[PDB]
């Protein structure tokens, strides 16, 4: 299966420090049955774009810890060096050993260096910022801000930012993770109030302060533990449901087809 | 300041830059790239001389900053600088390449290519190449509307190609790329590649007629 949150993710960001091109992972033709044509990111697309700009990529650093996404030969046949750099798992940020490996590799290599993890934000930005600070004498503030502006809010894991500031600055000055854009969660699973009629005095509430408050008060009034609409949900009657009408008092009403 | 290649030892036929010619006519100082394993495997390709590695591994090693003596009185600096005999090297017929310059005319006619005649009584006769030789080829081109085979040397011919044909580049910056030429000028031949639509201007001699599909 294709990774989640990948279809809406931009393929590439702006180059960082004139050297690094951050990317989400490419997906080979093996995934074409799961990815519509407009959303495809074959490696050939990256190489063709670079050729169209008469730009060469010296090296592509793969941080995904897997070979199931695309064929490395699609990159290597174009004269681009390919390296699979294994990073610390379990959701932890890259180790000092991982950062030293990344720096040792990249200092060997004008041409761009492509860097990608599954989505191209957290591991990618962590390693790019580490290189900027340790090798190019950037401040960590500048590195984090620049990566945030190149690939939108580049690092959004709070512990990643905290560890970057612990290693290279003051941990107490680490910024909080950015608020995420709406496209991040469109695949996790209405503006018209009433369908077919236009209704006066009724205007949808998108104001961020009061929206959460109205939802919160409804939750607390219903005693609803989870997220979402707290109201009672009736279920369709079957031959095993109807026997319940004998087991306790019940009231009936006609159901008009309406909007809850 | 010439180039030689050593005869004996592990450095056989390796490019050595003649640093200083000793006037005693016995040995000369040679700049070499060490084919050593830094006393790690033995109890090898050419790679740069790593002084820190040979200081770490120990053994027969003496340090003088960048100057160094190691493993059988091998003298290196910054790059080996060791004396070797004139009779133990070949001082005639090395001719190193550009990659060796970074470390320290021509005729190419092929059968099937199309060439024209630029001078003489048989001028502007375009024919396909049959055979090839070294300097005076005495070619036998199959001209248009001529059943006979004439004779032309290399200095008289030129790789002329009609507009709109398969073209490849043999050497230079544009080598490996294919495509179609558009307009043939006096010597500037412009073409568009099979991969990209960028203008590539080449000399007439740097073109060949090959009908294979581009790799990409
Ligand atoms: O082959 C899979 C799978 O067998 C094994 N694996 C993953 N989770 C578990 C588990 O909870 N319990 C057991 N016994 N085995 C498990 O891991 C193999 C693949 O490893 P991954 O590299 O895919 O692990 P991954 O990177 O996905 O973890 P994470 O980085 O997403 O947190």
Using the Cβ of B175 and the Cβ atoms of chain A, whether some distance falls under 8 Å is answered with no
For residues A193 and A203, give the distance between their C-alpha atoms in angstroms, rounded to a whole number. Answer: 8
The residue whose two tokens read 């056989």 is: B12
Q: Which of A51, A78, A80 to mutate to test the interface with B (most CBs of B within 10 A)?
A: A51
Residues of B in contact with A52 (CB under 8 A): 196
Radius of gyration for the alpha carbons in chain B, expressed in angstroms and rounded? 26
| Ligand 1 nearest atom to the CA of residue A89, by list position | 30
Q: DSSP state, B49?
A: -
Contacts of B141 (CB under 8 A, 6+ apart): B115, B125, B126, B127, B128, B129, B130, B149, B150, B152
Pocket probe for ligand 1: among A63, A84, A89, the residue whose CB has the most ligand atoms within 8 Å is: A89
Overall size of chain B counted in residues: 216
B4-8: long-range contacts, CB 8 A cutoff, minimum separation 24: B4/B28, B4/B30, B4/B89, B4/B90, B4/B91, B4/B94, B5/B89, B5/B90, B5/B94, B6/B30, B6/B32, B6/B84, B6/B88, B6/B89, B7/B88, B7/B89, B7/B90, B8/B88
- Residues of chain B contacting A54 with CB distance shorter than 8 Å: 198
Residues 6 or more apart whose CB falls under 8 angstroms from that of B189 comprise: B161, B181, B201, B202, B203, B204, B207
Ligand 1 pocket (Cβ < 6 Å) reads A 65, 89-91
**Catalytic (active-site) positions of A:** 117, 255
CA distance A119 to A124: 9
B195 in contact with A at a CB cutoff of 8 Å? Answer: yes
Sign of CA dihedral B97, B98, B103, B104: positive
Separation in Å, CA of A73 to nearest CA in chain B: 13
User: What is the CA(A66)–ligand 1 centre distance, in A?
Assistant: 11
Q: How was this structure determined?
A: cryo-EM
Nearest C-alpha neighbor of A62 from the set A107, A8, A26: A26
| Span from the CA of A60 to the centroid of ligand 1 (angstroms) | 25
Residue A101 φ then ψ, to 5°: -60, -45
- Is there a contact between A54 and B198 if contact means CB atoms under 8 Å apart? yes
* B176 in reach of chain A (CB within 8 A): no
Distance CA(B125)–CA(B111), nearest Å, equals 17
A5 is an annotated ligand-binding site residue: no
Residue nearest to atom 25 of ligand 1 (CA): A89
* Residue B24, min C-alpha distance to chain A (Å): 44
- Orientation angle between helical segments A96-106 and A122-136, nearest 10 degrees: 70
Q: The tokens 């979402």 sit on which residue?
A: A228
Among A44, A45, A52, the strongest candidate for a mutation testing the B interface, having the largest count of B CBs within 10 A, is: A52
Q: Which residues of B touch A51 (CB under 8 A)?
A: 195-196
User: Are A52 and B195 within 8 A, CB to CB?
Assistant: no
What's the gap in Å between A68 CA and the centre of ligand 1? 14
């Amino acid at each position: 299966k294709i990774p989640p949150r990948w279809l809406n993710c931009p393929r590439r960001g702006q180059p960082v420090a004139g050297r690094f091109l951050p990317l989400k992972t490419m997906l080979g033709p093996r995934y074409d049955s799961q990815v519509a044509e407009e959303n495809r990111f074959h490696p050939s697309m990256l190489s063709n774009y670079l050729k169209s700009l008469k730009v060469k990529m010296g090296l592509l650093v793969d941080l995904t810890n897997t070979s199931r996404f695309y064929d490395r030969n699609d990159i290597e046949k174009e004269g681009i060096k390919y390296i699979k750099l294994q990073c610390k798992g379990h959701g932890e940020c890259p180790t000092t050993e991982n950062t030293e490996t990344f720096i040792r590799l990249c200092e060997r290599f004008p041409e761009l260096i492509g860097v990608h993890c599954t989505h191209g934000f957290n591991r990618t930005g962590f390693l790019i910022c580490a290189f900027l600070v340790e090798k190019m004498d950037w401040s960590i503030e500048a590195a984090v801000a620049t990566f945030a502006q190149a690939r939108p809010p580049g690092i959004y894991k709070g512990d990643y930012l905290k560890e970057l500031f612990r290693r290279y600055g003051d941990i107490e000055e680490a910024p909080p993770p950015p608020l995420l854009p709406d496209w991040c969660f469109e695949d996790d699973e209405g503006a018209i109030f009433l369908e077919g009629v236009t209704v006066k005095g009724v205007t949808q509430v998108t104001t961020q302060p009061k929206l959460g408050e109205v939802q919160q008060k409804c939750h607390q009034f219903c005693g609803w533990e989870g997220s979402g609409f707290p109201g009672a949900q009736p279920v369709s009657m079957d031959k095993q449901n109807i026997k319940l009408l004998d087991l306790k008092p019940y009231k009936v009403s006609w159901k008009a087809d309406g909007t809850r | 300041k010439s180039w030689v290649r050593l005869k004996r030892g592990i450095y056989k036929d390796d490019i050595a830059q003649v640093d200083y010619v000793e006037p005693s006519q016995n040995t000369i100082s040679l700049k070499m790239i060490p084919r050593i394993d830094y006393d790690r495997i033995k109890a090898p390709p050419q790679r740069l001389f790593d002084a820190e590695k040979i200081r770490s591994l120990g053994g027969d090693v003496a340090s003088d900053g960048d100057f160094l003596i190691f493993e059988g009185n091998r003298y290196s600096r910054k790059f080996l600088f060791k004396s070797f005999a004139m009779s133990a090297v070949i001082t005639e017929g090395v001719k190193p390449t550009l990659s060796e310059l970074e470390k320290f005319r021509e005729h190419n006619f092929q059968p099937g290519d199309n060439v024209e005649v630029c001078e003489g009584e048989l001028i502007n006769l375009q024919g396909k190449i049959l055979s090839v030789d070294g300097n005076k080829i005495t070619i036998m081109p199959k001209h248009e509307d001529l059943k006979d085979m004439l004779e032309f040397p290399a200095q008289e011919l030129r790789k002329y190609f009609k507009m709109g044909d398969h073209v490849k580049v043999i050497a230079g910056r544009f080598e490996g790329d294919t495509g179609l030429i558009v307009r043939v000028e006096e010597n500037f031949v412009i073409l568009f590649s099979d991969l990209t639509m960028h203008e590539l201007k080449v000399l007439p001699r740097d073109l060949q007629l090959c009908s294979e599909t581009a790799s990409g």
